[PDB]
């Protein structure tokens, strides 16, 4: 039942709403993920959505996440990016908007997260190696 | 405010057969993100009032199956596959879109 | 002060992608397969966004593209099994028909007799049957034969296929969705105020018309007009009506039908001999209708080009048949009805019905094709047709700075503008879960 | 953000050793795929590149002043410099101090970063 | 070799066994799920089996359980959902049985455990970012 | 920018360079695994692409080592399999090397990896069961 | 030694009009990894040099969308879609590849 | 030289050259296309 408190909305449902309140509906999102000419498409259709979900799983993977839908990255932000306020972002910002600003500059981030990671993931390894 | 209107009012029945009620509202029950608000209620001579189905056709814990519902939009109904002598009493159907809440007048049920 | 860097998967975040989108229905013979077309949905959810507003643009989108190539296909899946008719090709012999042939029919109907096979190579049949004057040519009584001959060799529909234009509902396949705008006034072009997701579009009637949209989907409010550009006059002009206007089509000859078998397990389905009084098929419409619907066409179409000036509607140009005429096959009976008694008025500033002739014929090719016909068999006796008009399809007369007597004239051609006219309130886009956003969440090192 | 200063003397006598010094503020000169360059912008015949020190302390020389040219560094107070013998007339140029981009074990990055101001050295009496 | 030991039993051997001693064989049964018409007919069952197996992965992945066959949750076991002693369950029952008869409380199980994830990934986010 | 310190190298690069300075470059191998008749046969190649690649995160998840590319495990190596030092190996040999002398005595360690992993995996929960 | 060889080598051009610049080298930058090693350079009067460009097409951070480039195996181009008056100065072309590094001659540009 | 078994004169020889020599080949006789239309949709080119 619909009340004061919390809201429940439907797939792609805050799209129109702020990250902090948006962050709490990502499950419904990822959760939906998932005549021979007409069969070659289908399975074209399907082929496809398998790919994408891989390619983002394989992206999740190598990063120091392997499986969570809100994890943490040991690297500091760069102003340069956006240099916004805290606050401001996730009480005043939407993620299509936020998308928009970010947009040229994912591949750098990318790149900084899988060097971290490397760079990490070796460590890690040399320290355990002492025992 | 969304009234909710039932018929039959009274229901003369016997057991051994099914049964069936009607519950309209005045106002669609589909809400903004595609769900339906709609619960069916029950409530013995006396007693205090037992949550039977929910969320339109959703089948509460620990009541028989042979209570049923169907719908969507504004027309629902509540289909018993067999009745018992121990299902005499009122039944509400209950809404939690729509502020203020409110049910229906109530229908009762008796032996023939 | 310090911010880390995080990573979101589940955004709401999407853009704009091509994708090919599968036929759903309701799964219930017929022209159009629907057996690929798997279930549609129960009880389909429509999901209604707040605050967000998306930039539609019509004229682009690939859904008229990908219906296009659907509609393609099941066409010419429908019309594989079917018998070729290559031994037709023959000289015919006709001669004209003067049982109780009107003023205005004469000449239309031709007698023609020829040498046909049979099931046995080794024997020849003569027969007989009736064309129509629009698909014989004389060759230089006297002999004649088929127009289709000197192009190509072309199938006969099959009887069992019916051509009733049942709903098909387009759905999104995983990964993607599609994108609804919920506004009562929208243009053809520019951000929806109110943006709303939906599993699987709305039945859309795959009906085939060339003048005037018909069996469609209405306005929600008053009428909207719909251009790429309205100030290029080579540009199409679509303008959806709020309320319809009814009209009645018939084919009053009560004719029968002859089967010829032309070869083993191969029959002909040619016209027999037509029993009763003949009489030209036509259709109606409503003046009172018409005029008020012209009236209303005219008053939202003067907001666009001025008060002042005053607008005009003039007949077709010329061409060929398939664009000069409005056309539409109801009844298993292709029509050509002459729509000059329909725009022959004037819009100056501030016994009941009207009735236009149609033709017959049985060669129809359909869009813009010349190497391959189809031959509509007869349909044994009276077909009537009643029908709902809910747009048209106008052309403006390119003009110099005459400021006044805007001439505008009907006219469509490509099979895309019809679908145009009920997919303008979609897209597909593809949902990108992935995000990224700062926090100051650090990390555990362990 | 970083920023890159040169120091030492502006005015040298003909023949003998001269000696510059770029400081380093902002980041660190241990960085792990960082390079630091010495640069020279000669009047008319063009930039040339003295040398450079990696962050694992080894010296590349060019092979025409790999005889004159030596660069040294210290950590311990984030900063480096250039020892340059047998000056001549011909040296009288503006000395930059840059930081350009290692190639990763994982990524390819080219490009000079940041660029300092200008010293510009006089080799006359 | 057979002995008085342990044994090996087959693919799906173990579905007679108790649920105690079949809950030692989970890795054999998760190792084992991986004419032009006919062609269409073998990608088709390939990317049934494919999209099958991702379906299972996604619902571990939502939960807390993405890479292990054997995860414990937070959420308590509510006693109306089965009333059963825990020996009698593990030594006295089969799978095929306890599926049977806790088929009708699936869809509520998986919602709660979803939830409590999505909670319990919220609230370490938030402790985290003390640190 | 090339220079004395790292380098990058290309996709499958390194196969020359020993083993100890080849496992720094692991990510770039891993990020890049993702007219009738022509539909069927590169439908036919991505989805034995798919295959392969969930096969191998299928290995990788049977054993406790399922979202990292550099993990340890708990079972020692016989001395049988390769009888040699340990800088000979990392210093002075290469993958291909390595591959094709161990190529005999791979399913061994693969199932020794499974059943340790299940072992620990029981031990685990009856040690958490105290809780 | 890989020498850089610009051209032309000045570009009086006035505000309203593209403009367009040329780099070529001696030797092959196609390095055996196959990545290019190529970047440009923008200074100003008595000031340090900027990198506007870098890996032949990537546009720094903080430098304006009016500068482009494109280029591979051994020719280059520089080409600016919206020129203004602040554009006036020296362009260097350099390579981080061969060793040592070189950069052009240094082509000016000034209003005509 | 390229070859399976040189000794094995049963297999093929293959070589290849450094340098290319040009060949010059035409069809001096200037002759004409003819249409003949052997049915309906249907066309035979004949030689003129
Ligand atoms: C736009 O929308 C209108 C709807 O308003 C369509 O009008 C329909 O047109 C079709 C023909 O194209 C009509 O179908 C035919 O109706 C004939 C009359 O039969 C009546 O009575 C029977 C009793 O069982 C009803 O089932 C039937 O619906 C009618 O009410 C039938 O005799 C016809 O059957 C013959 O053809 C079919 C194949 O089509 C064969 O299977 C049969 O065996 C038989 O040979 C046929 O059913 C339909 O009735 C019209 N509807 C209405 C409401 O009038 C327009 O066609 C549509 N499109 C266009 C372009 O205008
Ligand atoms: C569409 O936009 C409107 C306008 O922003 C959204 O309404 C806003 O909802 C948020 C809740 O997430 C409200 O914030 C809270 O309001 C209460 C009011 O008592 C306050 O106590 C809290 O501290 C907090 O500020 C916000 O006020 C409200 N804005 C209004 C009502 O003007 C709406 O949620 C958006 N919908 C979607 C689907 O994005
Ligand atoms: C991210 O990069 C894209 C390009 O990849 C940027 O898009 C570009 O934005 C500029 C404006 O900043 C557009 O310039 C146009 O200039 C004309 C003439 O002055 C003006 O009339 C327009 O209104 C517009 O300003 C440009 O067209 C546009 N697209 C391209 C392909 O260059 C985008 O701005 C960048 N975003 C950020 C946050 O840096
Ligand atoms: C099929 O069901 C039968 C039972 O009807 C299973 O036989 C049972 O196997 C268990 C194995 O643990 C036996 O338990 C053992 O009993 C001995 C003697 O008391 C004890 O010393 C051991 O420590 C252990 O508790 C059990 O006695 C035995 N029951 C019978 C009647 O033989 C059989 O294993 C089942 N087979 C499959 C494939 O599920
Ligand atoms: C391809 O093979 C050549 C020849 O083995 C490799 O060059 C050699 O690489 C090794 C390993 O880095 C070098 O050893 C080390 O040299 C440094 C000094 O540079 C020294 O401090 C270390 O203690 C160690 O000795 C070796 O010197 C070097 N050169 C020669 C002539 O052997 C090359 O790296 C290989 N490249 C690839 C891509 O596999
Ligand atoms: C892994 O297994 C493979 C195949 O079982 C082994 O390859 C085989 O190795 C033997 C040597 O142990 C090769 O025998 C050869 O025989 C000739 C004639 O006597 C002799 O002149 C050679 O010096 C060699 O001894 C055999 O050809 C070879 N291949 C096959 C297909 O059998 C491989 O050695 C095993 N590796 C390890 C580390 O055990
Ligand atoms: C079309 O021509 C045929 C061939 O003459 C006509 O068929 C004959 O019509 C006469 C007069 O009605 C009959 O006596 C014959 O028995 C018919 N059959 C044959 C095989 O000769 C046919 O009636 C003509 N139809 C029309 C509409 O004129
Ligand atoms: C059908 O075939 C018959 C048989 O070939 C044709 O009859 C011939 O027509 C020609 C031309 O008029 C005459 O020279 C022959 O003597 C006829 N032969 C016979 C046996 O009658 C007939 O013309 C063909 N066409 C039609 C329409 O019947
Ligand atoms: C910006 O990136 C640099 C990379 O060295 C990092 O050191 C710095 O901390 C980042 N931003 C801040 C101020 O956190
Ligand atoms: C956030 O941005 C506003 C707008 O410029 C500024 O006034 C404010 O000081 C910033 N910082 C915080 C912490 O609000
Ligand atoms: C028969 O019809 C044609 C038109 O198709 C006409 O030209 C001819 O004169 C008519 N002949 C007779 C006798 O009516
Ligand atoms: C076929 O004949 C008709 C009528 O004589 C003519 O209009 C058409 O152009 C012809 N087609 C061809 C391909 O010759
Ligand atoms: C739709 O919007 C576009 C863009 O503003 C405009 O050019 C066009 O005239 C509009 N059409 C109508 C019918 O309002
Ligand atoms: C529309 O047509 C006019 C000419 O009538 C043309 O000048 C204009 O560029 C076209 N496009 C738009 C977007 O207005
Ligand atoms: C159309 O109108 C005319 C008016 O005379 C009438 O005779 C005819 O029967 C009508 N046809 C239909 C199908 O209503
Ligand atoms: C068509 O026929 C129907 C029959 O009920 C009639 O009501 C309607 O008015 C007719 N329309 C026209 C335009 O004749
Ligand atoms: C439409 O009806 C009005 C009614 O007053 C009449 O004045 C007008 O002339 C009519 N127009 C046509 C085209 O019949
Ligand atoms: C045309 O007339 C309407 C009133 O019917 C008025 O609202 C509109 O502004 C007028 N058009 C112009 C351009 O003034
Ligand atoms: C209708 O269009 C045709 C085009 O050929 C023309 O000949 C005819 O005159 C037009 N009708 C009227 C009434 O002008
Ligand atoms: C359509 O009807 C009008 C009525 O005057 C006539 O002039 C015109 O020629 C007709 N069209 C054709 C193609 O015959
Ligand atoms: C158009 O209207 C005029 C009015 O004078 C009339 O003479 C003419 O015949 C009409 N044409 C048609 C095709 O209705
Ligand atoms: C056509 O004529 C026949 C004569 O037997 C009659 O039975 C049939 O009903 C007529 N067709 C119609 C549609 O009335
Ligand atoms: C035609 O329009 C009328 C009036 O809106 C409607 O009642 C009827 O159902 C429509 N018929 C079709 C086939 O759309
Ligand atoms: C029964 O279910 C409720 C959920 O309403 C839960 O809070 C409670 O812990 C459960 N009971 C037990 C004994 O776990
Ligand atoms: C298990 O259930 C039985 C009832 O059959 C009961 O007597 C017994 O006490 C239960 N075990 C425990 C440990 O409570
Ligand atoms: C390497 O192994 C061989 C044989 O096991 C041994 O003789 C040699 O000493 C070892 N080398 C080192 C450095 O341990
Ligand atoms: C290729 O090398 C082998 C081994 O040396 C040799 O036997 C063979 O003759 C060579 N091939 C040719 C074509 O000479
Ligand atoms: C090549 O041919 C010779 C005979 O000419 C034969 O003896 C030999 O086995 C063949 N194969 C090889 C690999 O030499
Ligand atoms: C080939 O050479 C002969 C020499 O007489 C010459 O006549 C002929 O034209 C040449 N052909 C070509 C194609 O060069
Ligand atoms: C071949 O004959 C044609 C005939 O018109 C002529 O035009 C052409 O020039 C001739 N070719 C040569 C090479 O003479």
Redesign the interface.
Same mark, same amino acid.
């Given at each position: 039942? /619909?009340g004061i408190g919390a809201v429940?909305?439907?797939?792609?449902?805050?799209?129109?709403?702020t990250?902090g309140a948006?962050?709490?509906?990502?499950? /419904?999102?990822?959760?939906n993920?998932?005549?021979? /000419? $007409?069969?070659? =498409?289908?399975?074209?259709?399907? &082929?496809?959505? /398998?790919?994408?979900?891989?390619?983002?799983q394989?992206?999740?993977?190598?990063?120091?996440?392997?499986?969570?839908? #809100?994890?943490?990255?040991? &690297?500091?932000?760069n102003s340069?990016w956006?240099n916004r306020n805290?606050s401001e #972002?996730?009480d005043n910002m939407? $993620?299509?908007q936020?998308?928009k600003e #970010?947009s040229n500059?994912?591949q #750098?981030?990318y790149?900084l997260?899988?060097?971290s990671?490397?760079?990490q993931? =070796?460590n890690?390894?040399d320290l355990?190696a002492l025992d | 405010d969304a009234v909710l209107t039932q018929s039959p009012l009274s229901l003369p029945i016997t057991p051994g057969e099914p049964a069936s009620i009607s519950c309209r509202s005045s106002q669609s029950l589909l809400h903004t993100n595609g769900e339906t608000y709609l619960n069916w209620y029950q409530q013995k001579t006396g007693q205090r009032p037992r949550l039977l189905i929910s969320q339109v056709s959703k089948r509460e814990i620990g009541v028989p199956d042979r209570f049923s519902a169907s719908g969507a939009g504004s027309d629902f109904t509540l289909k018993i596959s067999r009745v018992e002598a121990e299902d005499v009493g009122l039944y509400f159907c209950g809404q939690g879109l729509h502020w203020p809440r409110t049910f229906g007048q109530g229908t009762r049920v008796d032996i023939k | 002060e310090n911010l880390w860097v995080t990573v979101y998967y589940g955004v709401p975040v999407w853009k704009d992608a091509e994708t090919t989108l599968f036929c759903a229905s309701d799964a219930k013979h017929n022209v159009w397969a629907t057996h690929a077309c798997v279930p549609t949905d129960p009880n389909p959810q429509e999901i209604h966004l707040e605050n967000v507003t998306e930039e539609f643009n019509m004229w682009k989108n690939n859904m008229v593209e990908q219906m296009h190539t659907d509609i393609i296909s099941l066409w010419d899946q429908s019309l594989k099994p079917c018998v070729k008719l290559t031994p037709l090709c023959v000289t015919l012999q006709c001669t004209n028909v003067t049982n109780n042939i009107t003023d205005d029919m004469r000449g239309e109907l031709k007698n023609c007799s020829f040498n046909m096979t049979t099931e046995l190579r080794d024997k020849k049949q003569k027969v007989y049957s009736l064309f129509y004057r629009l698909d014989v040519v004389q060759i230089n009584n006297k002999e004649y034969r088929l127009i289709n001959c000197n192009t190509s060799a072309c199938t006969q529909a099959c009887p069992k296929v019916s051509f009733e234009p049942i709903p098909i509902h387009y759905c999104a396949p995983a990964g993607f969705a599609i994108l609804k705008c919920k506004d009562k006034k929208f243009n053809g072009t520019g951000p929806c105020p109110s943006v709303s997701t939906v599993q699987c579009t709305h039945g859309i009637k795959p009906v085939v018309s060339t003048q005037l949209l018909l069996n469609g989907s209405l306005a929600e409010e008053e009428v909207m007009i719909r251009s790429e550009n309205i100030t290029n006059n080579a540009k199409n002009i679509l303008v959806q009506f709020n309320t319809p206007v009814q009209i009645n089509c018939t084919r009053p000859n009560n004719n029968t039908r002859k089967s010829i078998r032309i070869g083993p397990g191969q029959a002909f389905y040619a016209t027999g001999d037509i029993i009763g009084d003949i009489r030209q098929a036509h259709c109606n419409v409503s003046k009172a209708t018409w005029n008020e619907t012209l009236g209303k066409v005219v008053k939202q179409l003067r907001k666009h080009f001025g008060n002042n000036t005053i607008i005009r509607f003039a007949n077709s140009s010329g061409g060929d048949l398939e664009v000069t005429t409005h056309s539409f096959n109801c009844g298993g009976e292709f029509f050509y009805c002459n729509t000059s008694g329909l725009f022959n008025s004037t819009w100056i500033s501030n016994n009941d019905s009207i009735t236009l002739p149609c033709r017959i014929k049985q060669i129809i090719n359909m869009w813009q094709r010349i190497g391959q016909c189809m031959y509509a068999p007869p349909i044994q006796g009276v077909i009537r047709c009643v029908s709902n008009i809910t747009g048209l399809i106008l052309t403006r007369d390119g003009g110099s700075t005459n400021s006044t007597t805007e001439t505008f004239r009907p006219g469509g051609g490509d099979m895309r503008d019809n679908w145009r006219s009920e997919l303008y309130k979609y897209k597909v886009v593809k949902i990108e879960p992935l995000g990224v956003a700062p926090t100051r969440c650090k990390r555990r090192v362990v | 953000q970083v920023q890159l200063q040169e120091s030492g003397p502006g005015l040298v006598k003909p023949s003998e050793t001269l000696s510059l010094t770029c400081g380093v503020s902002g980041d660190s000169i241990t960085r792990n795929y960082y390079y630091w360059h010495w640069i020279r912008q000669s009047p008319g015949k063009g930039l040339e590149g003295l040398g450079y020190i990696a962050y694992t302390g080894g010296t590349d020389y060019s092979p025409s002043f790999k005889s004159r040219v030596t660069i040294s560094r210290d950590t311990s107070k984030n900063q480096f410099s250039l020892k340059l013998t047998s000056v001549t007339v011909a040296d009288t140029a503006v000395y930059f101090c840059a930081r350009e981009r290692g190639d990763s074990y994982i990524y390819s990055y080219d490009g000079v970063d940041f660029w300092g101001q200008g010293l510009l050295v006089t080799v006359s009496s």
């Open positions: 039942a /619909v429940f909305l439907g797939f792609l449902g805050a799209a129109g709403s990250m948006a962050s709490m509906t990502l499950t /419904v999102q990822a959760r993920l998932l005549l021979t /000419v $007409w069969g070659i =498409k289908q399975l074209q259709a399907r &082929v496809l959505a /398998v790919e994408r979900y891989l390619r983002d394989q992206l999740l993977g190598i990063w120091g996440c392997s499986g969570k839908l #809100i994890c943490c990255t040991n &690297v500091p932000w340069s956006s805290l #972002i996730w939407t $993620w299509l936020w998308d #970010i500059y994912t #750098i981030i790149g997260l899988e060097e990671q490397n760079q993931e =070796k890690e390894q355990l | - | - | -």
